[PDB]
Amino acid sequence: DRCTCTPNARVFVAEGQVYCTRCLSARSLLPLNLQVPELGVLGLFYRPEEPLRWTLPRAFPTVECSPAGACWLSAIFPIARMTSGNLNFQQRMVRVAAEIYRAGQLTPTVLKTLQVYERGCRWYPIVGPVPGVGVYANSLHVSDKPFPGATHVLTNLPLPQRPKPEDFCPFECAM
Amino acid sequence: DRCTCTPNARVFVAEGQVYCTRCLSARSLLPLNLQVPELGVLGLFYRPEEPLRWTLPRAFPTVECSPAGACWLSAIFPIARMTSGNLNFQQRMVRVAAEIYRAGQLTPTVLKTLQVYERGCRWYPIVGPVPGVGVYANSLHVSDKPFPGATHVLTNLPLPQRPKPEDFCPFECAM
Numbered sequence: 365d366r367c368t369c370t371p372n373a374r375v376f377v378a379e380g381q382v383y384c385t386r387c388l389s390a391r392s393l394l395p396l397n398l399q400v401p402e403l404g405v406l407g408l409f410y411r412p413e414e415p416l417r418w419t420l421p422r423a424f425p426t427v428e429c430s431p432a433g434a435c436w437l438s439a440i441f442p443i444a445r446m447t448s449g450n451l452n453f454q455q456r457m458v459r460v461a462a463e464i465y466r467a468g469q470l471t472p473t474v475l476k477t478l479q480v481y482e483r484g485c486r487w488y489p490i491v492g493p494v495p496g497v498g499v500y501a502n503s504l505h506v507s508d509k510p511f512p513g514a515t516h517v518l519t520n521l522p523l524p525q526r527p528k529p530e531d532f533c534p535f536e537c538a539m
Numbered sequence: 540d541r542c543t544c545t546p547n548a549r550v551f552v553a554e555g556q557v558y559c560t561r562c563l564s565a566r567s568l569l570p571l572n573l574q575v576p577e578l579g580v581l582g583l584f585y586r587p588e589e590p591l592r593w594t595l596p597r598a599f600p601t602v603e604c605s606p607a608g609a610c611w612l613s614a615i616f617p618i619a620r621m622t623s624g625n626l627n628f629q630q631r632m633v634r635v636a637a638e639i640y641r642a643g644q645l646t647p648t649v650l651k652t653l654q655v656y657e658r659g660c661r662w663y664p665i666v667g668p669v670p671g672v673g674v675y676a677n678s679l680h681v682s683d684k685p686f687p688g689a690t691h692v693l694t695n696l697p698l699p700q701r702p703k704p705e706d707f708c709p710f711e712c713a714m
């Protein structure tokens with residue numbers, strides 16, 4: 365039982381799995397006939413409706429950048445979950461993906477547009493394990509799980525450490 | 540940087556880590572001088588204030604029961620997160636742990652007391668990967684992650700499958 369939406373339905377990455385932004389079901393590999401070579405790893409699952417507006421170089425996942433080239437695909441779910449409630453999530457997931465996909469990267473400006481801070485998320489200097497969902501990051505990459513190099517974690521959890529002021533963001537352009 | 544609360548502060552298990560119910564920081568092993576042998580694995584981190592009211596047999600984690608004997612320690616965080624908001628979580632975490640610890644097991648009655656269903660959680664027959672936090676289970680055990688044997692997943696996520704009526708619960712006594 366996999367996702368059966370039109371292949372132009374956006375995708376996000378949680379832990380290992382590629383999931384559909386529309387139905388939240390695991391996404392299988394695209395038929396290669398539909399695959400969009402110009403979109404690296406993303407094109408292996410996502411086939412947009414029209415142009416691209418930006419491209420993705422096919423590559424291997426680095427110990428810190430995964431999916432290689434568009435690690436922000438990994439921040440879509442955590443930002444949406446920490447930024448919505450029970451009867452509000454779908455709408456949120458859809459708006460968060462659209463924003464990020466459009467920008468083709470994660471940036472302080474895209475986080476402001478998404479009101480991540482006003483909704484309860486705070487960055488924290490990683491000093492140990494953090495339970496639940498979150499966005500781990502450094503000055504160039506982000507992930508939904510900890511990784512070698514990550515220096516900060518974005519969470520809505522009332523942590524013991526001291527939150528970073530709202531003007532702070534570990535990166536300028538996480539890709 | 541670990542937890543530095545009084546050792547009588549309750550504990551919960553998320554993924555691998557043992558975390559403190561009070562400060563949400565990782566919990567180190569108890570000095571063995573404080574360790575409470577009568578509380579199996581739990582006693583290796585948690586030292587109550589007075590009696591026990593129930594005991595825990597020391598053992599090895601089974602492919603389906605972990606922590607061995609009190610796998611419900613793994614359901615504390617997911618139930619609390621899916622059942623609270625941003626400015627409400629701590630209170631929720633504290634009430635959820637106390638309830639479960641008292642009952643010394645997870646049961647349909649303890650889930651009703653915690654109003655898991657009225658707050659948005661629904662059980663679903665596992666048919667594929669599910670992103671985010673959740674409680675995986677079968678008729679005898681539960682976990683915060685999928686495991687060989689699990690047949691159902693409790694989530695507040697608006698999944699595509701069809702939710703189980705509110706009278707349904709995969710188990711009668713998950714320990």
Ligand SMILES: [Zn+2]
Pocket residue numbers: 367368369373384385386387388389
């Ligand atoms: Zn879909």
Ligand SMILES: [Zn+2]
Pocket residue numbers: 428429430433434435436504505506538539
């Ligand atoms: Zn990257």
Ligand SMILES: [Zn+2]
Pocket residue numbers: 542543544548559560561562563564
């Ligand atoms: Zn503590």
Ligand SMILES: [Zn+2]
Pocket residue numbers: 603604605608609610611679680681713714
């Ligand atoms: Zn068990």
